[PDB]
């Protein structure tokens, strides 16, 4: 504990993410909405926005 701040301990956690190629398993807190068809709508499919 007497060393300089460059020589002090540092706990590192690396969170690595996989982009969507498989079915989505982990997804954040957003509510679902009923599906509507044959209308010009702004959709959102697992982060796919259009």
């Amino acid at each position: 504990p007497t060393y300089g701040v460059g020589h002090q301990p540092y706990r590192v956690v690396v969170l690595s993410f996989e982009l969507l190629h498989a079915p989505a398993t982990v997804c954040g807190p957003k509510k679902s909405t009923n599906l509507v068809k044959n209308k010009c709508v702004n959709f959102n499919f697992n982060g796919l926005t259009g």
Partner: protein, 50 residues
């Protein structure tokens, strides 16, 4: 106002031992990259301290 200046010449320069000398956070460089200092090499090295 009276900063030091030192020539460095006719020697082999290992830049990984500097991390064992001072407790600095980052090896900030402008024209080169600190990971590539061991491979390529120079003509003159000037060390200034203040």
């Amino acid at each position: 106002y009276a900063w030091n200046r030192k020539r460095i010449s006719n020697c082999v320069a290992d830049y990984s031992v500097i991390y064992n000398f001072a407790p600095f956070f980052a090896f900030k460089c402008y024209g080169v990259s600190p990971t590539k200092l061991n491979d390529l090499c120079f003509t003159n090295v000037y060390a200034d301290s203040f």
